[PDB]
Amino acid sequence: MIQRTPKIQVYSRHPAENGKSNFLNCYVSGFHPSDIEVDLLKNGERIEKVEHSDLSFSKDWSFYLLYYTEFTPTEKDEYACRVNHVTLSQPKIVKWDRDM
Amino acid sequence: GVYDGREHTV
Amino acid sequence: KVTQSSRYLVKRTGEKVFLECVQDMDHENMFWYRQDPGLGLRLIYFSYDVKMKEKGDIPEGYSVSREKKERFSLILESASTNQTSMYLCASSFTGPYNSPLHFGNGTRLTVTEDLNKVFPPEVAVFEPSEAEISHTQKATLVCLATGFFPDHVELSWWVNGKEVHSGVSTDPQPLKEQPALNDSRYCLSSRLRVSATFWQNPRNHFRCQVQFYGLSENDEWTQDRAKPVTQIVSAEAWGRADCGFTSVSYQQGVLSATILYEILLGKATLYAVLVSALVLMAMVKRK
Amino acid sequence: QKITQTQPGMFVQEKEAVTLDCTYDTSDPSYGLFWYKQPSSGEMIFLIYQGSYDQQNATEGRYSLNFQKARKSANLVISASQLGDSAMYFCAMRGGGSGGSYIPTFGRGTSLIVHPNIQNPDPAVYQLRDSKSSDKSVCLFTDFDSQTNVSQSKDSDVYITDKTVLDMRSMDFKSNSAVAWSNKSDFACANAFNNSIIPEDTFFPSPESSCDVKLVEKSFETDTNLNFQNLSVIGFRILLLKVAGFNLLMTLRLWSS
Amino acid sequence: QTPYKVSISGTTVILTCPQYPGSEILWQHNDKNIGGDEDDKNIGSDEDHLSLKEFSELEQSGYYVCYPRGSKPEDANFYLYLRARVCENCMEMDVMSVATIVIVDICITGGLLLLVYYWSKNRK
Amino acid sequence: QTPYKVSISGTTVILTCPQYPGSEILWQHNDKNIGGDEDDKNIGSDEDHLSLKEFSELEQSGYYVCYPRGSKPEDANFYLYLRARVCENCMEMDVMSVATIVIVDICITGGLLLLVYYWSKNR
Amino acid sequence: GSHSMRYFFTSVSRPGRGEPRFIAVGYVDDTQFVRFDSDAASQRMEPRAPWIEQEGPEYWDGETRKVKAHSQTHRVDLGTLRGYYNQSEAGSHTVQRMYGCDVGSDWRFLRGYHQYAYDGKDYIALKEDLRSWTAADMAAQTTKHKWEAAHVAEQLRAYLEGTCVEWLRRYLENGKETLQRTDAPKTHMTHHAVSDHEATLRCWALSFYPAEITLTWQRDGEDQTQDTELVETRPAGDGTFQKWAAVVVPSGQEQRYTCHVQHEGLPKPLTLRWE
Amino acid sequence: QSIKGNHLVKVYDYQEDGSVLLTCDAEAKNITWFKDGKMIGFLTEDKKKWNLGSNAKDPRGMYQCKGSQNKSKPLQVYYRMCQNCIELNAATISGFLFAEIVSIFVLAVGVYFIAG
Amino acid sequence: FKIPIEELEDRVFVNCNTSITWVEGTVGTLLSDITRLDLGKRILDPRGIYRCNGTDIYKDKESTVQVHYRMCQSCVELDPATVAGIIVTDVIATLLLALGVFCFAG
Amino acid sequence: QSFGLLDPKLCYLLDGILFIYGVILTALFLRVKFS
Amino acid sequence: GLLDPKLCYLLDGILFIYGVILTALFLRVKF
Ligand SMILES: *[C@@H]1O[C@H](CO)[C@@H](O[C@@H]2O[C@H](CO)[C@@H](O[C@@H]3O[C@H](CO)[C@@H](O)[C@H](O)[C@@H]3O)[C@H](O)[C@H]2NC(C)=O)[C@H](O)[C@H]1NC(C)=O
Ligand SMILES: CC(C)CCC[C@@H](C)[C@H]1CC[C@H]2[C@@H]3CC=C4C[C@@H](OC(=O)CCC(=O)O)CC[C@]4(C)[C@H]3CC[C@]12C
Ligand SMILES: *[C@@H]1O[C@H](CO)[C@@H](O[C@@H]2O[C@H](CO)[C@@H](O)[C@H](O)[C@H]2NC(C)=O)[C@H](O)[C@H]1NC(C)=O
Ligand SMILES: *[C@@H]1O[C@H](CO)[C@@H](O[C@@H]2O[C@H](CO)[C@@H](O)[C@H](O)[C@H]2NC(C)=O)[C@H](O)[C@H]1NC(C)=O
Ligand SMILES: *[C@@H]1O[C@H](CO)[C@@H](O[C@@H]2O[C@H](CO)[C@@H](O)[C@H](O)[C@H]2NC(C)=O)[C@H](O)[C@H]1NC(C)=O
Ligand SMILES: *[C@@H]1O[C@H](CO)[C@@H](O[C@@H]2O[C@H](CO)[C@@H](O)[C@H](O)[C@H]2NC(C)=O)[C@H](O)[C@H]1NC(C)=O
Ligand SMILES: *[C@@H]1O[C@H](CO)[C@@H](O[C@@H]2O[C@H](CO)[C@@H](O)[C@H](O)[C@H]2NC(C)=O)[C@H](O)[C@H]1NC(C)=O
Ligand SMILES: *[C@@H]1O[C@H](CO)[C@@H](O)[C@H](O)[C@H]1NC(C)=O
Ligand SMILES: *[C@@H]1O[C@H](CO)[C@@H](O)[C@H](O)[C@H]1NC(C)=O
Ligand SMILES: *[C@@H]1O[C@H](CO)[C@@H](O)[C@H](O)[C@H]1NC(C)=O
Ligand SMILES: *[C@@H]1O[C@H](CO)[C@@H](O)[C@H](O)[C@H]1NC(C)=O
Ligand SMILES: *[C@@H]1O[C@H](CO)[C@@H](O)[C@H](O)[C@H]1NC(C)=O
């Protein structure tokens, strides 16, 4: 029963510019087993209305998921996603960068 | 369409 | 291997009727079918697997039960005349890949508005014509079974105590005596063809047997005539040569000759004893 | 998902090949076709199965299939037909369950009759002896051509059966026969099958009888009791002969003195 | 226990069931009740006899059972299997009959021989 | 081909296996091993004969086969189909025997008659 | 060109509460078009693409019945596989199943596959010829034998070479507008000086379908297999995909570097130089 | 004529020979047979029927069979076949009278000549 | 691989899938069906040895069958006491005849 | 057509023996009477 | 044919009386 550690990417659907609506995505892949805890954070606090896709796996039987929400980027706000898994000793927080 | 034959268990 | 509870059944209107079907191949799908003349097979009910069921195109009047994997029970709540037909049960695997249905032998069911109309057959046998024997050296026996209801009979030929299959031709189905009107009894015929030499041997025994399926022991009978229960009715004949010399004539002649010769021997031995005594007396008195 | 067998009733001579037709239509991506035979007993006997995604036709014994997916036909081919092939044949199809219905659909049914090849026909009408237990007279029409075929009577009191084929393996003889009987004094075998078109020169026996004593004595056999009785007769004869000789000798001995 | 009595006289066969004396008796042959008051003169029944006139071997051979009225045939404790050939005029040749015929023939012939011997002595 | 030897005496039937002179043989009847069980008194076996006591025509008629030990009983290619009507004290004899016994009885009685007459005439 | 249809099934046991959680998804190429979840309220197979809603009630009833049969099979399989490995009754375990088929540009059968896994590792699979099995460990051997006795591979091959291709062709016809499209990537590159001396050049690729693409870096023809970082292709959330690749270089040497992108929606493979 | 009710012995008639056979319904391996109560033999799994010999000797008597359970009820068998019956028609009486008159005349002539 | 022997109404037949080779015994009569041979009535005690091939499989291995019938056409019940009685009675008759000859000589 | 031990050759054989005996005896009687 | 033994009986019945009469005549004339 090998256990794999998730890989995390945080980004947006469209190129970001201040003032218009957009989508924030936290994408996790390559983990086993399938129980995982994913949250999207605005200034360090949870966002209530978050949707996610259906569970699926790759050729090597490792799962992947996508979480997304609507937001409006500004110059003076911070966004991140927090992930907790059985293979992690402490939760991992990844911040959103406009250049990545 | 999903598989529609006979089911077999391990 | 699919087995149905019965092969023949007769019931009165209003009764509750049970039909069973058991298979041992561990099959998922099970089906109950009804066959009618000119209508083909029509599905009453089917079951994907245990505890689930779905209606067919004619599910009115029937109920089903699939509590177990290997059993599929059908129930007629109130028997009606228009439920008289042949019922078939089938089972198969799931899916369309090399999965045909496996049927049983079927069950023929007749529903009548009164048990007073059940009658057993009358059986008769007819011996071949001597004209046919002279013309072609063959003999044809004819068996007739008439006046029975319902048409739930089986016919067989037995020669010298053994069942015969070669040289036999039976009608495929019983036929109504008068088809014009309702409440008509049935008739059936069969033919057995044999060589003329085999027929006119008086030692040969021929028998036509009809097995009839009728009322069971759990049915009330309040009529003067006998209760028409499942039974067997037969008709027998001996081989016949109306002319010529056979074994029975020879046997009669031998017994007659035997008794006549015993009588003659008695007379001869009496005369022998008498003449011996006369000789003895002559010898005694001579000296 | 429906099947049609257009043609009701087929006829074939024995030792010949026959084809029964079946056409289907369906939109289900997966389906199978398969055939049954039902004899007079009433059971369904599975014959042959073919799926929609296999190269070549299915063959099993004397049964083969002509499967044309392009024109949606699944014909059943029977080779070297035998007398036991007379039955009712059914065409059936089942589907996967998402492109159509799941429950199997059956055809209407096609009847097949095999006729024997009669080398030497000899049509005749015979009168069977009275049964002394029922008031019926039976006429037997036998040995016709299998192209001849019989009709019912108008009379309600006269019963005629359809033709039936009989096989005698004892002397490899095949025959066609039909039987008529009635309840009436004016019932005679001369007019028992008027309404049917019997061929010419049909033998009608004379009311008198004939005998062949040689044929009767062909079927003669004995048992142990008859043999023992015959030996007893021979022994009695020889014993009587010896006793009679002794008696005559003694009476000549005394009469001489 | 006690068997049936079978009496044969010509083409008439009489069956007697000695069990259950005095009680009325019902008879079944081949699971069909017989001996009742049905319109037939060949078959007759009285207290403990059954008369079958013009006996037919093929139709009337088989199983016979006697049981009291209001009981069931299976409660009868015996069955009879009867198969016979009947004759209007067939005198049997057992040891007693053949011996009787032989003895009477000897006695008549001897009487005639002694009578004619004395007569011949008287004439000559 | 050397046939089986069949001998019937009363209700006793003896069968001999012809073409296996140098091995112990086993017998089968209608696809069922028969004989060689050292039991079933009415059935016995020896070197090359099978003996059947109280032979029953209805149940003991049919196919018989003989095969060496060690060979599965379908390599054999020579069967015997036997149907016999047996009888207690029943002995077979032809009409020629009756003719000869009658002739020899008549001849010996006549010869004795002539001998007695010649012996008595002179005295 | 080539197309494929794929089905994924996952079942996770909950040894303390309820029956195992079961999830099924169906894909045509890179587009999900159907799903089922045992914890949802509908308890039905549900559409996920606009072109699949044309199907009638009988299609959805049949699919629902078959997928519930799938879930029952997985439940029994978990129960048996627990015994086969001598594990306690308190842990949580997973079974995964995947099968599908491929077709070429002529829409004829190309290949098929069917695979099983227990707790994240291979258990038993079908070989390339779809006629014999491949077992991983000793415990699989028993199952292999049983299936070889039951002619499972014949049913599976009949479905994979048969029904699968027909369903795929029907789907491709009914969804021609969206399934047979191709989107060329929108491409641009950015520059960021790290502190004072080095810098990073990152070439992007936005809004392309399907998801298969190649990104490379060249230094005057030198293939930079190392010294570059590229991330996994990621979904955008609307049916398209994103990717980027970055390289770290000394300042003033930007014109020496170029980024090459090749997709199938590009008539000729591109070449990007900074500004 | 029912298996239940302890009626187990049946008659198996009309064979090629004149033999009369009895059949016991019990499915037991060992079958013992009794005539008038006293045991007369036993049969094994191979033989299912008891032979009473030819029907021309008029087999008569009381028969029962027993397997593993108690003894079945007796069955009475009665045969009357006329293997010796003679039709006394005109030919028979004519032959009898001719033989009688010939024999009496021969003996009368013999005793006439041997007189004195 | 046993050659089927069939027992119809009162005759006995040999059945093969090919022509039957007569090895010895009763010759029999052909039915115009090459794969069937009639040996006649059973009470005539047909005896012989025959040979033929197969058709479904085993098309290179032979088969032979021997038919032996014994139906007591000529058998006769003979108790030892009865034959003793017959022989002794015949001896008594021959001595009585010899005594008659002796009395006639005198 | 099987007689077994019922072939009429036996009774006719007895008749032939009796006939030959009778004919030779009556021939002898005529010879003696004419002599 | 003539398998009826009645003819055989008629012949031996005639032959017996003829033979006994001729034996009586011959033996009395010769002795
Ligand atoms: C004369 O030819 C007939 C065929 O025309 C032979 O009968 C056939 O024999 C084969 C033997 O292989 C039978 O096949 C068997 O079928 C059973 C049941 O399906 C199966 O378990 C066996 O493994 C085998 O395949 C075939 O059914 C049978 N045909 C009929 C109609 O019975 C016959 O044996 C030939 N005669 C001789 C003496 O060989
Ligand atoms: C020893 C000498 C003195 C001869 C005795 C008188 C003969 C004239 C007897 C001897 C045997 C008798 C025959 C013995 C047997 C028969 C069989 C018998 O057969 C039947 O046809 C009767 C049965 C039937 O017809 O049903 C007819 C009389 C007949 C010919 C008898 C006729 C008279 C015969 C020839
Ligand atoms: C068969 O006969 C029965 C009894 O006469 C009838 O069944 C009726 O069927 C209708 C539906 O067509 C129901 O509404 C009635 O309630 C039924 N009656 C009873 C008493 O159950 C009808 O004549 C025939 N039914 C069919 C299906 O053919
Ligand atoms: C159910 O039908 C089968 C036929 O499909 C019957 O089996 C046949 O039984 C007869 C015995 O009379 C055999 O001669 C046949 O060879 C059998 N056929 C097959 C295919 O096995 C079976 O007897 C039927 N069931 C019942 C209870 O009668
Ligand atoms: C079943 O057999 C028939 C008869 O051979 C096949 O139909 C033939 O197909 C070829 C294709 O090249 C045609 O040229 C022939 O004309 C067809 N025959 C007839 C009589 O028209 C059919 O293909 C076979 N089924 C399968 C599945 O192969
Ligand atoms: C036997 O059956 C039918 C009765 O009409 C006759 O067969 C017909 O033959 C013609 C030939 O051109 C066909 O067109 C018909 O279709 C046949 N009819 C049927 C019902 O098959 C045939 O003539 C009859 N026999 C005789 C001697 O008349
Ligand atoms: C049985 O089959 C064998 C062979 O299959 C036949 O023997 C052959 O006889 C011919 C003579 O015409 C020879 O030329 C062959 O060499 C023989 N074959 C072998 C293998 O020896 C035999 O004739 C067949 N018998 C019957 C009755 O059909
Ligand atoms: C019986 O009679 C009724 C009413 O007269 C009629 O409707 C029905 O059709 C008859 N039965 C048949 C079988 O025709
Ligand atoms: C004709 O048959 C009927 C019954 O089928 C019967 O009632 C009637 O009496 C018979 N008629 C004659 C003249 O036998
Ligand atoms: C019935 O057949 C006879 C026989 O020739 C014939 O005279 C008569 O006209 C026929 N009757 C009918 C109605 O066909
Ligand atoms: C069968 O009968 C024999 C004969 O004595 C006997 O030894 C044997 O024990 C019986 N069978 C059983 C099972 O007792
Ligand atoms: C069998 O009959 C005997 C008679 O002695 C009786 O004691 C016994 O109880 C009967 N057995 C059964 C099972 O009735």
Author numbering:
A (entry chain M): 0 to 99
B (entry chain P): 1 to 10
C (entry chain B): 3 to 289
D (entry chain A): 2 to 258
E (entry chain F): 33 to 156
F (entry chain E): 33 to 155
G (entry chain N): 1 to 275
H (entry chain G): 23 to 138
Task: Pull verbatim passages from the article behind this deposition.
The recognition of antigenic peptide-MHC (pMHC) molecules by T-cell receptors (TCR) initiates the T-cell mediated immune response. TCRs are expressed as heterodimers of α/β or γ/δ chains in complex with three CD3 dimers (CD3εδ, CD3εγ, CD3ζζ) that are responsible for initiating downstream signaling. Here, we report cryoEM structures of two distinct full-length α/β TCR-CD3 complexes bound to their pMHC ligand, the cancer-testis antigen HLA-A2/MAGEA4 (230–239). We also determined cryoEM structures of pMHCs containing MAGEA4 (230–239) peptide and the closely related MAGEA8 (232–241) peptide in the absence of TCR, which provided a structural explanation for the MAGEA4 preference displayed by the TCRs.
To gain insights into the structural basis of MAGEA4 (230–239) peptide recognition by two distinct TCRs, we determined cryoEM structures of full-length PN45545 and PN45428 TCR-CD3 complexes ligated to HLA-A2/β2M/MAGEA4(230–239) (henceforth referred to as MAGEA4 pMHC) to resolutions of 2.7 and 3.3 Å, respectively. These structures were determined in the presence of the Fab fragment of the commercially available anti-β2M monoclonal antibody 2M2, which was used as a fiducial marker to improve the cryoEM signal of MAGEA4 pMHC. The overall TCR-pMHC binding orientations of PN45545 and PN45428 follow the canonical docking polarity important for productive coreceptor binding, with the Vα regions positioned toward the HLA α2 helix and the Vβ regions positioned toward HLA α1. In both cases, TCR contacts (within 4 Å interatomic distance) are limited to peptide residues D4, G5, and R6, which form a solvent-exposed bulge. Peptide contacts for both PN45545 and PN45428 are mediated mainly by CDR3β. In the case of PN45545, CDR3β residues F95 and Y99 make apparent cation-π and hydrogen bond interactions with peptide residues R6 and D4, respectively. These and other residues in CDR3β also make van der Waals interactions with peptide G5. CDRs 1α (S31) and 3α (G97) contribute additional contacts to peptide D4. For PN45545, Y50 from CDR2β appears to make a cation-π interaction with R65, while in PN45428, E52 from CDR2β forms an electrostatic interaction with R65. To confirm the reduced affinity for the MAGEA8 antigen, a steady state surface plasmon resonance (SPR) binding assay was used to determine equilibrium binding affinities for the detergent-solubilized TCR-CD3s and MAGEA4/MAGEA8 pMHCs. PN45428 demonstrated approximately 10-fold tighter affinity for MAGEA4 as compared to MAGEA8 and PN45445 demonstrated approximately 70-fold tighter affinity for MAGEA4, consistent with the greater specificity observed for the PN45545 TCR by flow cytometry.
